[PDB]
Amino acid sequence: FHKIRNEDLIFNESLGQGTFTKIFKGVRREVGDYGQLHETEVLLKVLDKAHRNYSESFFAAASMMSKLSHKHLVLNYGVCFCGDENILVQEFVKFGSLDTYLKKNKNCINILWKLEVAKQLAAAMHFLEENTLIHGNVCAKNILLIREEDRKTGNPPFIKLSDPGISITVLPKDILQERIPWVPPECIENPKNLNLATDKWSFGTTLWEICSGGDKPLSALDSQRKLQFYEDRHQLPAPKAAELANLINNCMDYEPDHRPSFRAIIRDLNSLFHH
Ligand SMILES: Nc1ncnc2c1ncn2[C@@H]1O[C@H](COP(=O)(O)OP(=O)(O)OP(=O)(O)O)[C@@H](O)[C@H]1O
Numbered sequence: 001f002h003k004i005r006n007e008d009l010i011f012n013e014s015l016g017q018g019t020f021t022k023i024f025k026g027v028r029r030e031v032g033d034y035g036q037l038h039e040t041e042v043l044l045k046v047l048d049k050a051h052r053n054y055s056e057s058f059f060a061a062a063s064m065m066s067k068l069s070h071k072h073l074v075l076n077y078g079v080c081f082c083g084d085e086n087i088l089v090q091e092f093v094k095f096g097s098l099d100t101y102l103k104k105n106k107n108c109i110n111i112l113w114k115l116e117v118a119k120q121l122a123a124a125m126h127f128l129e130e131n132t133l134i135h136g137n138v139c140a141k142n143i144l145l146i147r148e149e150d151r152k153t154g155n156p157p158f159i160k161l162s163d164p165g166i167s168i169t170v171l172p173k174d175i176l177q178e179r180i181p182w183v184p185p186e187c188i189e190n191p192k193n194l195n196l197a198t199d200k201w202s203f204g205t206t207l208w209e210i211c212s213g214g215d216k217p218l219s220a221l222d223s224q225r226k227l228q229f230y231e232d233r234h235q236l237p238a239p240k241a242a243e244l245a246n247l248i249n250n251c252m253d254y255e256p257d258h259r260p261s262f263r264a265i266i267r268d269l270n271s272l273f274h275h
């Protein structure tokens with residue numbers, strides 16, 4: 001990662017906490033193309049140095065994925081370690097998290113918009129699959145909306161997938177349980193079961209969120225009931241927009257070896273019309 005001077009970062013707004021992170025909107029002063037001085041809007045993800053294992057996992061993850069440039073993967077500009085903390089400097093995505101976006105717009109988007117976003121996410125995941133890179137933190141909050149749909153020009157919404165964060169192989173078991181049903185059953189059983197199949201399961205859960213207006217699946221269940229949900233091998237209810245219900249269930253297969261490849265997922269979508 002490109003090292004960014006601490007004096008070149010300004011923190012403007014707090015955006016709350018993530019998973020052992022503090023997140024801010026800020027500005028980076030930089031020399032850009034043609035030597036132009038810019039003040040670029042940035043997302044700053046702050047990790048405490050004292051949480052050494054978490055920080056190492058987080059930055060290893062961000063670093064590996066950032067070696068893989070793709071139009072649907074978020075851009076990281078660099079890192080700043082020369083402070084009291086370790087900071088990831090990321091592009092600021094104008095329309096924020098997809099789940100929030102769907103809530104704020106009262107789910108007034110049509111099925112074709114949802115399908116377009118699903119196809120974009122699937123394209124990102126196929127690229128990661130071909131690169132044998134496990135993300136491990138796919139969910140609608142981690143889908144960032146770059147651009148809204150434009151009816152006049154016919155341009156679809158455009159998304160990027162966030163950095164992976166701290167690996168579920170290092171996070172505390174209680175956090176994994178809270179993350180049912182994004183974390184698949186085999187990882188609740190042993191986090192070492194993390195695999196490319198993991199992201200197929202989480203993709204299914206993410207599609208459920210997209211089709212449910214940014215609702216969270218199993219929100220009414222505490223962690224003990226979420227464990228019972230997997231014990232009894234339940235599936236999620238068909239979402240409000242039921243068009244993707246079959247694909248959701250096929251991806252959320254309790255047998256990880258039976259989850260379809262992302263190429264197969266993409267074909268199914270097209271046919272509708274660190275660790
Ligand atoms: N690149 C970005 N641009 C704009 N907003 C962002 C960006 N990344 C995150 N956010 C916003 O920051 C807030 C915190 O994000 P989030 O909970 O995903 O943090 P995190 O550190 O990535 O945690 P996790 O690993 O659980 O995803 C949310 O409001 C989210 O929309």
Ligand SMILES: [Mg+2]
Nearest residue numbers: 018141142162
């Ligand atoms: Mg995130």
